[model samples]
Target chain A: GFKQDIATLRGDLRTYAQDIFLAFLNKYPDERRYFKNYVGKSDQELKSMAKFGDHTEKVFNLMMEVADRATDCVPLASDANTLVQMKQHSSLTTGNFEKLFVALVEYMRASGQSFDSQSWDRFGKNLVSALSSAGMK
Target chain B: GFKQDIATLRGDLRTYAQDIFLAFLNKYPDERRYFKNYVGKSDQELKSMAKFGDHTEKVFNLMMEVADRATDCVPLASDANTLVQMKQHSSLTTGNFEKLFVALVEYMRASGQSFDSQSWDRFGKNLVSALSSAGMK
Candidate 1:
């Protein structure tokens, strides 16, 4: 069921993850402070950074699972809550997964994937609300 | 060539990652303090812990790469260095990636995977030395 969307978002998940995390770091300068130690490093280095690369992959994996689990609400909500709960240490507020959404939108466009902001936003908001209802924080 | 190893690892990397991290935390009780905020949650919640899950996945991925790239020394060394660098913020000391290896060996056993302690230890030592040589302090 989610394969259609997955197929639409063609490209390796690792690359998508690297691109998205780096995009967010650069696009939103404030997030850089969270990973300041690698401030002057090259883009590749930033992508390779444990903080960024691994962090991106886990979120990416979770995001994919969340989408496919649309019919399975508890795990979906649980995954969503975990995504946000991760930011408990970072500056990311409760609803900041939107930043990840914003990055994904840009990534899909650049990668030549079809653009459907409405569908993505709807999905993101639903995930966030589901997490909230699950008492993530 | 190493894709054989990767393919054989079987099962989701995220779950493997979660299992490894939990095993590490439980076995080395002191490690739990590093992720104090998300303590006492369900395994899923702990797995989703922003720091633990995402971090574990990234490192787990890196570990896989380091093993696979045994012939490609440059990137292997770089990956090892980057892995340790990420842990610089945590309590993990230099060459501490061995900790990950030890846990991985145990994880493989628990998962019903064939055991190859000698191969794992060899690769782990090589990786740790590579990180040291890469000047990852």
Candidate 2:
């Protein structure tokens, strides 16, 4: 099932909502709505792009949206196939998770690479803090 | 006169509107209302970001809409002088206008490179054809 990976992703967003919101807004504008408004439009509205009834299309576009926006702070292997497995099968292993995610985000904030460590740390700490509240997994 | 640059910018848009429209949709969904309706709700609206006001609050915001949505395709090197010039003069140049404006569109596409040159050429030619018939330019 796509349960565990989805759980981690959900955990990631719930945790880094603020940092992600802040960093993401710089690259995008309307995204400000996400931070200004907690749960944007709706999970269904975000998910239900394309047409209203297409569940699979909704899921794939959500995956793209998540990967595009949320996964900036996520840790997937360098490989796309690896990422596919990571999303559907399991989370990244502890050994490689932190470094890989940081590297990718660092690359995106190229001119402002400092944003990498600062924002990543902020995001990581938030995720960990959430884990504490949830009592971990 | 600012007349020259507007002609060029308008030329570039005619060439790449469809491609820009699609990519714009994928990246800036929150602006769906602007692209779909081009109408802004006043006071609640953004503002006159540049000068030649569109459906948005002001010319400034209109320029940003073009800049942000089409950054890859459209490079953002506009200066305050150019903004004022465009507003006061009311135009851009034609000699190398399409080339310069396309620089914005081409750069903004995906990684901001390799836009379909053929499409851009046709877009420009077709506009000139239409303009010749109108006998106003």
Candidate 3:
């Protein structure tokens, strides 16, 4: 179901990122123990924190980078998986990424942007599945 | 001093970006014509716009890219000038870059980040001056 239509929403990618950050903090308080030092006290508070904002920017930008590079040979979700694995450059754990996966799906819905859920779900699942081999998904 | 100290704040560079965006939209309404399609209808509206956020992210990322690449062979100011020329990739005019320059300085002062204005002004001046000649520093 994923179409190039999702690429049209590239402009709104940051909101997708913002929601992911908020979701991680609000929905999974347990994850706070991981990013508390970098992510601030509350959802909105996290927005004001530059360190956290930088991380969110990275997430959004990575999505753009992967989507931007997608060609006829590879699907966007496949490229997304590679980038997710490459994110090991940062300290995000598998739990955090699984949380990011849910938030990403929720954000696609909340953002009012047209996205193919099944396709994006494939991307997110690939990301977590790879992470699960490392630990938890 | 804006010295290597600017590198220390690269983590917060995007905050400098958000402020630059809000400042540009709030202070220079005339410039909005260039980005009317991407920017929101108003201040509150801007807060919810991912298109605007993407542009801000680019500005901040470019700044960090240039700064991150600077070294003894490439003085910060000279590097700033080169990037200014490179920014033509976006079709931004000298006038636009000038506005960006002012907003950048103002945002630095207003954002409470540690920066060396003397150095930043030197760098910003170099950018605008290059635009005047359509060349490098």
Docking class of 3: incorrect
Between prediction 1 and prediction 3, the one with superior DockQ is: 3
Name the runs in model 2 displaced over 4 angstroms.
A1-94, A102-116, A124-137, B1-97, B100-137
| Candidate 2, lDDT over the whole model | 0.35
Q: Predictions ranked by lDDT, top down?
A: 1, 3, 2
All candidates: CA RMSD (Å)? 14.9, 19.0, 10.7
- Checking candidate 3 for backbone clashes, the offending pairs are none
lDDT of 3 by residue, A1-137 (tens): 35354334333445556776677567777666755474347667777765666587565655544443445223355544454456443566555666766766776666665667556666666656554554433
Task: Compose the digit string of candidate 1's lDDT tens values, residues B1-137.
Answer: 33444534422565676777778776666666666675677776765455665566565665565565576323376676666566444445543566766776677667765556556656766777776786655
TM-score of each model, paired residue for residue: 0.46, 0.22, 0.46
Q: Any idea what lDDT model 1 has?
A: 0.61
TM-score of chain B of 2: 0.26
Worst 10 residues of 1 chain A by lDDT: A1-10
* Ranking 2 against 3 by DockQ, winner: 3
The per-residue C-alpha lDDT of model 1 at residue B84 equals 58
